[PDB]
Design an enzyme around this catalytic site. Structure first.
Site, short mmCIF file in Angstrom:
data_model
loop_
_atom_site.label_atom_id
_atom_site.label_comp_id
_atom_site.label_asym_id
_atom_site.label_seq_id
_atom_site.Cartn_x
_atom_site.Cartn_y
_atom_site.Cartn_z
N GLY A 1 7.21 -8.08 -8.09
CA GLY A 1 7.80 -8.28 -6.76
C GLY A 1 7.79 -9.71 -6.31
N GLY B 1 5.99 -17.36 -3.73
CA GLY B 1 6.58 -17.17 -5.05
C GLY B 1 6.48 -15.79 -5.66
N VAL C 1 5.66 -12.62 -8.37
CA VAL C 1 4.52 -11.86 -8.89
C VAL C 1 4.99 -11.17 -10.17
CG1 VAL C 1 2.68 -10.16 -8.43
CG2 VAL C 1 3.54 -11.58 -6.55
N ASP D 1 -5.64 -10.02 8.80
CA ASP D 1 -4.32 -9.45 8.45
C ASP D 1 -4.47 -8.17 7.63
OD1 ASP D 1 -1.13 -10.65 7.04
OD2 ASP D 1 -1.53 -9.37 8.77
CL1 LIG Z 1 3.04 -2.07 -7.76
C1 LIG Z 1 1.78 -3.27 -7.82
C2 LIG Z 1 1.28 -3.79 -6.65
C3 LIG Z 1 0.30 -4.76 -6.70
C4 LIG Z 1 -0.19 -5.21 -7.93
C5 LIG Z 1 -1.24 -6.25 -7.99
N1 LIG Z 1 -2.30 -6.12 -8.79
N2 LIG Z 1 -3.12 -7.19 -8.55
C6 LIG Z 1 -2.57 -8.02 -7.59
C7 LIG Z 1 -1.36 -7.45 -7.22
C8 LIG Z 1 -0.47 -8.10 -6.20
C9 LIG Z 1 -0.87 -9.55 -5.93
C10 LIG Z 1 -2.37 -9.69 -5.76
C11 LIG Z 1 -3.13 -9.28 -7.02
C12 LIG Z 1 0.33 -4.67 -9.10
C13 LIG Z 1 1.31 -3.69 -9.05
#
Ligand SMILES: Clc1ccc(-c2n[nH]c3c2CCCC3)cc1
Length: 342
Positions: free
Chosen positions: A22, A27, A29, A139
């Site tokens: 996402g 930025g 992910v 938050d």
């Molecule tokens: Cl669908 C999904 C949502 C979050 C994550 C995720 N896993 N670990 C993190 C994140 C988001 C950013 C912070 C660290 C993995 C898959």
């Protein structure tokens, strides 16, 4: 350098087989295979060096997550960046890969009373550690609560976090606020800067109400609508609760409103556990001074199956006029420990 659905995501040879998850604040992910630990990880690309506020939020979050070490708080596993300040345009934060977040889960999944109970216990257990460090998250919301395939929960996104400052919490009526509107305590719109621990407890109360019905309890559409939503359920504040508001504009606003009756929790949430609603009431208390604290909430009968103060650790020690160039340099120095040179 590896590319993902458009631009550069160069996480070196260590992290391969990238997949778009996402988008974050600064930025992209991605999920990735960690060739050293042999597990799939989450990687957040952060590009904040143009705006000093984005630099402040990145630094503040890196500093906090690097000092914190708790099962219910997302850690930083690794930080990927260029070897020199001159070549550093972006920062990559490597964290444990989680299955989903409570926001995504609540859009399509009904939570059993057992899941609500366990999730709330883990939120408050993580929050106990944060507050013991004299830090306010500020938050808390479902999208800032990560969950893996076995329902282990971790609090993330400390970009708006502050060191608690209760003696400097007072402000005027209608003071502009940054944190997500729906989880804002009623005092934010009246006379608070959100510099007290009680602001986080309100947000947890909102999350608990949301876990009970799969819908935000106070979905304000704008700044003052938020307070109207809160009062439509809690009813009118008592004379005693109004007398605690010394700010004349804030108090007169509340006095100008027609009387509103309290909506009973058991009518809003008719299938909820009675002990869950008793705790919800104490968390969603109008008066911040009477609102339950994190350790009291953990000791509430609703969380009896989990409560163990000896297994609810606290931080070993307590924890914006700085230019973007000084902040980039501080981000560079804060992320130095992850460079291969050691
Ligand atoms: Cl669908 C999904 C949502 C979050 C994550 C995720 N896993 N670990 C993190 C994140 C988001 C950013 C912070 C660290 C993995 C898959």
């Amino acid at each position: 350098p590896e590319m993902v659905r458009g631009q550069v995501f160069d996480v070196g040879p260590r992290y391969t087989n990238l997949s778009y998850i996402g988008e974050g604040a600064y930025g992209m992910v991605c999920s990735a295979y960690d060739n050293v630990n042999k597990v799939r990880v989450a990687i957040k690309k952060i590009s904040p060096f143009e705006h000093q506020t984005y630099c402040q939020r990145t630094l503040r979050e890196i500093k906090i997550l690097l000092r914190f070490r708790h099962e219910n708080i997302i850690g930083i596993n690794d930080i990927i960046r260029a070897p020199t300040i001159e070549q550093m345009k972006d920062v990559y934060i490597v964290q444990d890969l989680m299955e989903t977040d409570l926001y995504k889960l609540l859009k399509t999944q009904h939570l059993s009373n057992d899941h609500i109970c366990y999730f709330l216990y883990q939120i408050l257990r993580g929050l106990k550690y944060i507050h013991s460090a004299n830090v306010l998250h500020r938050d808390l919301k479902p999208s800032n609560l990560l969950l893996n395939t076995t329902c282990d929960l971790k609090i993330c996104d400390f970009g708006l976090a502050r060191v608690a400052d209760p003696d400097h919490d007072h402000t005027g009526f209608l003071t502009e606020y940054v944190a997500t509107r729906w989880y804002r305590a009623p005092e934010i719109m009246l006379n608070s800067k959100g510099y007290t621990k009680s602001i986080d407890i309100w947000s947890v109360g909102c999350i608990l109400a949301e876990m009970l019905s799969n819908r935000p309890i106070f979905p304000g559409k704008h700044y003052l609508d938020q307070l109207n939503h809160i009062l439509g359920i809690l009813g009118s504040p008592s004379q005693e609760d109004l007398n605690c508001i010394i700010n004349l504009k804030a108090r007169n606003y509340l006095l100008s409103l027609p009387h509103k009756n309290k909506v009973p929790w058991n009518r809003l949430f008719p299938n909820a556990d009675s002990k869950a609603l008793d705790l919800l009431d104490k968390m969603l208390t109008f008066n911040p001074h009477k609102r339950i604290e994190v350790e009291q909430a953990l000791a509430h009968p609703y969380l009896e199956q989990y409560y163990d103060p000896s297994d609810e650790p606290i931080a070993e020690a307590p924890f914006d006029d700085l230019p973007k160039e000084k902040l980039k340099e501080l981000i560079f120095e804060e992320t130095a420990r992850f460079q291969p040179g050691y």
